[PDB]
Amino acid sequence: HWGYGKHNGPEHWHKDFPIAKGERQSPVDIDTHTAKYDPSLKPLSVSYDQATSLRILNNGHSFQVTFDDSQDKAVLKGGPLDGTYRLLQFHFHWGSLDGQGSEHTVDKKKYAAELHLVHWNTKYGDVGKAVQQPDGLAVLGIFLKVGSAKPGLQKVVDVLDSIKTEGKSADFTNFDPRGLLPESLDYWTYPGSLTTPPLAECVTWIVLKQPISVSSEQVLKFRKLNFNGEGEPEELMVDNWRPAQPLKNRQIKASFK
Numbered sequence: 001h002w003g004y005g006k007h008n009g010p011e012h013w014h015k016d017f018p019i020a021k022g023e024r025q026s027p028v029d030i031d032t033h034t035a036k037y038d039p040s041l042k043p044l045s046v047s048y049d050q051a052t053s054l055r056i057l058n059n060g061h062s063f064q065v066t067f068d069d070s071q072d073k074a075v076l077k078g079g080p081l082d083g084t085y086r087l088l089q090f091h092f093h094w095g096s097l098d099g100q101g102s103e104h105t106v107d108k109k110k111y112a113a114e115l116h117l118v119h120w121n122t123k124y125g126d127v128g129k130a131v132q133q134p135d136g137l138a139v140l141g142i143f144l145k146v147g148s149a150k151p152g153l154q155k156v157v158d159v160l161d162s163i164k165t166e167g168k169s170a171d172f173t174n175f176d177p178r179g180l181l182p183e184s185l186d187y188w189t190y191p192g193s194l195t196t197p198p199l200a201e202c203v204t205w206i207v208l209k210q211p212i213s214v215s216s217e218q219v220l221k222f223r224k225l226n227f228n229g230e231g232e233p234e235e236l237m238v239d240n241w242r243p244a245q246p247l248k249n250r251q252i253k254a255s256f257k
């Protein structure tokens with residue numbers, strides 16, 4: 001019954017998931033002046049042209065768009081990664097106000113939201129097995145700021161009324177996640193974890209330097225979603241972000257100077 005409230009939020013999670021206080025937890029603050037440029041980092045390879053979106057779902061802690069990951073259709077490769085990572089789903093974290101909502105921060109700056117494109121390493125065969133491995137997942141993180149609208153996001157926001165409450169899902173085919181990407185693929189990378197329970201330490205994080213801009217109307221539609229199931233007291237789905245965790249014995253690497 002974990003969540004993001006006063007009595008079940010991130011400060012409580014360690015009781016059910018003691019790895020919450022582990023050695024490679026996420027998110028973290030990205031100190032841009034301390035991140036080390038690593039000229040050996042290869043360019044990110046994002047191959048999304050054959051992506052097959054399936055469903056969109058309110059899972060009670062966010063909403064997610066799920067993809068067919070039974071074939072190499074939408075994959076992430078290169079960068080700090082060895083091998084091929086299949087896109088399983090994407091989801092967002094966002095705030096009650098534009099000055100908060102992101103999980104990662106940049107020089108302590110919070111963005112209005114953060115997009116996570118979740119991929120798993122095909123050498124482990126399925127995502128359940130991948131989450132048990134130190135290099136099982138690669139999550140591509142993209143910051144959202146409020147300004148101009150993001151046209152590629154609009155098809156997502158327009159269906160959110162149909163999945164307002166926990167458990168609701170809808171058909172969401174032929175969605176192209178390339179429409180969510182910024183111009184630059186410049187990134188920071190570090191070894192980390194899931195940012196929701198079970199907080200497994202299985203993620204190579206790849207966080208893009210360039211945020212995308214979304215409109216105030218687009219983020220307002222995020223904030224109209226509900227944590228609760230239908231018929232329960234309405235609690236707006238906002239501030240579903242875990243705060244920055246201690247960096248401990250890790251170095252964030254940058255793909256750029």
Ligand SMILES: CC(=O)O[C@@H]1[C@H](O)[C@@H](O)[C@@H](CO)O[C@@H]1S(=O)(=O)N1CCC(OS(N)(=O)=O)CC1
Nearest residue numbers: 059089116118127131139193194195196197198
């Ligand atoms: C669907 C979902 O919300 O997460 C589940 C689950 O919590 C986790 O134990 C594992 C089991 O299937 O992974 C999936 S997930 O792959 O789709 N999932 C989504 C949210 C988590 O993303 S996060 N915020 O680290 O980036 C990563 C794992």
Ligand SMILES: [Zn+2]
Nearest residue numbers: 091093116195
């Ligand atoms: Zn996430």
